[PDB]
Amino acid sequence: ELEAMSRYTSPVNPAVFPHLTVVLLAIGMFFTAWFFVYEVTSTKYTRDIYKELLISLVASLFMGFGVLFLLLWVGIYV
Amino acid sequence: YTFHSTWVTSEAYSSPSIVLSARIIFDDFREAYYWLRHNTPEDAKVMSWWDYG
Amino acid sequence: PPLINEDVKRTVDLSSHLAKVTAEVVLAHLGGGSTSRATSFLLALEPELEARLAHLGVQVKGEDEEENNLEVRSGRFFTVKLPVALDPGAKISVIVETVYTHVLHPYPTQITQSEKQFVVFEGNHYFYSPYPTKTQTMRVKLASRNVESYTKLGNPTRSEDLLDYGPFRDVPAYSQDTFKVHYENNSPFLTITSMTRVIEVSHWGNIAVEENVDLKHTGAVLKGPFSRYDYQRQPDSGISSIRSFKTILPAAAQDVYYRDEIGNVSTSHLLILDDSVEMEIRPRFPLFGGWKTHYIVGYNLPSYEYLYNLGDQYALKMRFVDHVFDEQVIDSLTVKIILPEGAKNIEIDSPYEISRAPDELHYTYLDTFGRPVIVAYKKNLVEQHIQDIVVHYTFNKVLMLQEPLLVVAAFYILFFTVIIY
Amino acid sequence: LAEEGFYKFHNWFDDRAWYPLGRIIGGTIYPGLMITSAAIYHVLHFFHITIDIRNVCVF
Ligand SMILES: *[C@@H]1O[C@H](CO)[C@@H](O[C@@H]2O[C@H](CO)[C@@H](O[C@@H]3O[C@H](CO[C@H]4O[C@H](CO[C@H]5O[C@H](CO)[C@@H](O)[C@H](O)[C@@H]5O)[C@@H](O)[C@H](O[C@H]5O[C@H](CO)[C@@H](O)[C@H](O)[C@@H]5O)[C@@H]4O)[C@@H](O)[C@H](O[C@H]4O[C@H](CO)[C@@H](O)[C@H](O)[C@@H]4O)[C@@H]3O)[C@H](O)[C@H]2NC(C)=O)[C@H](O)[C@H]1NC(C)=O
């Protein structure tokens, strides 16, 4: 029917999208900068692949959620 | 230099050509063209100075 | 089962461009026995106006409404099932109400800038029906007091703007007669040629609806030169012209952008009322006659007010066609409901019959496979047609996550490529 | 040039300017901006960004 169902409260209150995006984007950007810095300042002999991979993963993760939430905040609401 | 550059960009070198403004907005340059696009035969020959072609 | 109409106080009124007629039928049953139950009831439309009917609804005195099935048994007679069966000798006040559209034509087709668009109607004195009626007095309400020619039957008396017709005590089974009135109706003749309503649902935030509106002024196509000077310096000038119209919004619209095909339009005034959001709209140019305009109106409203979610199954009830202006009329309407990424089962409960095409897919800013869209084509929509359409769809809760992770993977692949470089 | 493939724009007779004469757009304009904007729009479409052609052409 219709009475059994109840109002669809969103999982994330929209008023929190801007701040949530900012911090996530900031963290992601910082990680990306670190990766690029590490890439620039590293000789062939000293290039730990585990470190690179882990930093890459964390950076991409944060950047992805950041961009998504930023897009959402812009009012496209994908 | 940074200040003067921002001021020049803001006050003067940024003004919409088809939106004569003084906030009051004069958007005739669009209303007339829209009228033309909707209330004329599909084969008109609107003649105007080469500026607005 | 023989039925007799006792009183029919039909009152066609033509103040607007819609000829909505309401007849207060009173039905009684003959003295004949063994015909105790007469659950059904019949209605008919004139052969001239049969191909013009807008929403036709029946009623019973008090708070009630009835279902009028459409069948052929020829003027597409409507079968009405009375709520309570009536035995012989009973009486049942059936307030039949109908609305005819596009039935008012301007007799002077080409008025100049300053004339009143005289129109012309072609009605029917007697109440067309399949049962012989008793006395019936059709009262006509007009717009202005400038009648030119009205059919005289039984010496119709004239009020300030109301024409009363004498009671026709007896009529035959299929009594038909035509009358025409040539009055002055300088009212907004506005017909929406087409309207496309797009409703995009998003489980994250809100639901955004945008509608493209082509609208055209119908009566009294303008002839001769148009002069802005006369339009400004004279109030009498341009009586038939429509400077602006007001569109009632649903009281939750947050950011409403009125924009034409060419660009954002400066002129529009929206006021947030207690129960609604009013929005006066001026087109780019004052329409006179045969001057068509095309605009776009779109607002996004919070989802919590509408979307209903029970476990895994959601429901969305919304307005099929939203209000546009007072006494509107649509000639072509296509509703598209763009559901989210996953809508496994999409059942739709329509209040009335809607022609429906097959579903297709839409590709938004982050969809990787697409999202289902529901398309419904209808014609001849009026103000009364506004109803509530509900769709039931099952959307897996975790599926919404499926979008952000892909955005992460692409980023990660680029990082991996750099590592390879 | 976006909706219709490049090959349908290199040669293109526009009969909506200089009415009696008609000017050729295919071989009278430097096709640089149109092929940097069409390409920047096609890449976004391939990545399902689905931006408008009046919004990747202003920015
Ligand atoms: C892109 O396009 C969008 C959309 O077009 C555009 O956004 C619009 O921008 C305009 C700015 O020009 C916004 O206009 C505002 O409208 C407000 C609403 O006005 C209505 O309500 C007024 C209040 O009336 C109440 O009180 C009176 C008694 O005082 C009472 O009788 C009423 O019943 C009601 O209770 C009302 O006065 C007003 O009436 C206007 O229209 C009538 C004609 O019907 C005219 O006779 C009046 O003189 C009057 O003009 C209307 O009904 C309004 O409050 C607001 O006013 C502020 O600004 C003005 C100066 O412009 C000040 O004088 C005033 O004190 C306020 O500070 C303003 O006019 C409009 O709302 C936007 N619409 C949308 C959808 O966003 C963008 O600008 C475009 N983009 C760009 C870049 O241009």
Write the DSSP string, C119-169: EEEE--SS---SS-B--B--EEE-SSS----B--SS--EE-SSEEE-----
CA-based nearest residue to A3, from C211, C89, C310, C239: C310
The structural domain count of chain C equals 3
Same domain, C415 and C277: no
Going through B1-53 in order, the beta strands assigned E by DSSP cover 20-21, 25-26
Q: Which residue type is seen at A25?
A: L
Element holding C402 (H helix, E strand): helix C402-420
Same domain, C324 and C277: yes
Distance C271 CA to ligand 1 centre (A): 8
Residue listed under structure tokens 């919304």: C318
Contacts of C357 (CB under 8 A, 6+ apart): C375, C376, C377
Interrupted backbone of chain B, residues before each interruption (C–N > 2.5 Å): 22
CA-based nearest residue to C222, from C274, C137, C285, C279: C285
Assigned token pair, B41: 């035969």
Conformational region of residue C194, where left means phi above 0, alpha means psi within -120 to 50, and beta covers everything else: beta
Same domain, C199 and C307: yes
Element holding C414 (H helix, E strand): helix C402-420
DSSP H helix total and E strand total for chain C: 3, 30
In 10 A of CB C309, how many CB atoms? 19
As a whole number of angstroms, the distance between CA C13 and CA C184 comes to 14
Most informative mutation of C256, C257, C269 for ligand 1 (most atoms within 8 A of CB):
C269
Same domain, C283 and C324: yes
Contacts of C198 (CB under 8 A, 6+ apart): C209, C210, C211, C336, C338
Supply φ then ψ for residue C375, to 5 degrees. Answer: -115, 135
- In angstroms, the Cα distances linking D25 to B45, D15, D19, D28, D56 are 19, 10, 14, 6, 22
β-strands C190-200, C333-338 pairing = parallel
- In angstroms, the Cα distances linking C106 to C142, C163, C193, C217, C340 are 15, 20, 18, 12, 47
Same domain, C302 and C380: yes
Ligand 1 pocket check for C307: Cβ under 6 Å: no
CA-based nearest residue to C387, from C293, C305, C300, C318: C318
Element holding C327 (H helix, E strand): none
| CA of C268, closest atom in ligand 1 | 5
Domain end call among C185, C211, C239 = C185
DSSP string, A2-17: -SSSEE---SS-GGGH
Same domain, C340 and C403: no
Q: Give me the domain span that covers residue C219.
A: 186-395
DSSP string, C74-106: ---PEEE--SS---TT-EEEEEEEEEE-S--EE
Q: Contacts of residue A35 in chain C, CB cutoff 8 Å?
A: 415
| Angle between the N-to-C axes of helices C402-420 and A49-73, in degrees from 0 to 180, rounded to the nearest 10 | 140
- In angstroms, the Cα distances linking C172 to C273, C309, C342 are 53, 57, 60
CA-based nearest residue to C294, from C329, C253, C263: C263
Question: Do residues A30 and A63 touch, judged by C-beta distance below 8 A?
Answer: no
Q: Which residue type is seen at C312?
A: D
- In angstroms, the Cα distances linking C373 to B22, C285, C378 are 45, 35, 16
In 10 A of CB A57, how many CB atoms? 16
Provide the 3-class DSSP secondary structure of residue C230.
helix
Same domain, C258 and C294: yes
Residue listed under structure tokens 């779109």: C298
Q: Which residue type is seen at C381?
A: L
Q: Which residue type is seen at C343?
A: A
The sheet carrying C277-281 orders its strands as: C245-249, C277-281, C268-272
Cα C146 vs. chain centroid, distance in angstroms? 29
Question: Do residues C161 and C193 touch, judged by C-beta distance below 8 A?
Answer: no
β-strands C245-249, C206-217 pairing = unpaired
Same domain, C420 and C338: no
Interface of C with D in 343-402 (CB under 8 A): 363-368
Same domain, C127 and C262: no
Tell me the torsion sign for CA atoms C338, C275, C56, C185: negative
Ligand 1 pocket check for C247: Cβ under 6 Å: no
Q: Tell me the shortest Cα–Cα distance from C66 to chain A, in angstroms.
A: 22
Contact D50 C368 (CB under 8 A): no
Looking at chain C, which residue has its C-alpha nearest residue D49?
C365
Assigned token pair, A45: 């002999």
Residue listed under structure tokens 């739709």: C348
Contact C262 B34 (CB under 8 A): yes
Q: Contacts of residue A65 in chain C, CB cutoff 8 Å?
A: 404, 408
Instruction: Output Rg (C-alpha) for chain A, integer angstroms.
Output: 19
**Residue C150: beta bridge partners?**
C181
Question: Do residues C214 and C195 touch, judged by C-beta distance below 8 A?
Answer: yes
Q: Which residue type is seen at C300?
A: N
As a whole number of angstroms, the distance between CA D13 and CA B48 comes to 22
PDB resolution in Å: 3.6
Looking at chain A, which residue has its C-alpha nearest residue C255?
A75
CA-based nearest residue to C271, from C291, C296, C253, C293: C253
Provide the 3-class DSSP secondary structure of residue A56.
helix
Same domain, C171 and C49: yes
Same domain, C121 and C26: yes
Residue listed under structure tokens 């060419």: C262
DSSP state of A41: S
Tell me the torsion sign for CA atoms C348, C352, C358, C361: negative
Q: Where are the alpha helices (DSSP H) in D1-59?
A: 33-46
Assigned token pair, B46: 């609107």
Assigned token pair, C164: 């009363």
Conformational region of residue C257, where left means phi above 0, alpha means psi within -120 to 50, and beta covers everything else: beta
Supply φ then ψ for residue C119, to 5 degrees. Answer: -115, 180
As a whole number of angstroms, the distance between CA C258 and CA C282 comes to 10
In 10 A of CB C406, how many CB atoms? 15
Assigned token pair, C56: 């036709």
Question: Do residues C293 and C258 touch, judged by C-beta distance below 8 A?
Answer: no
Q: Where are the alpha helices (DSSP H) in chain A?
A: 17-40, 49-73
DSSP state of D48: T
Tell me the torsion sign for CA atoms C293, C115, B44, B48: negative
Buried b (16+ CB within 10 A) or exposed e, C3-30: bebebbbbbbbbebbbbbbbbbbbbbbe
Same domain, C406 and C362: no
DSSP H helix total and E strand total for chain D: 1, 2
CA-based nearest residue to C197, from C208, C212, C184, C185: C212
As a whole number of angstroms, the distance between CA C349 and CA C392 comes to 8
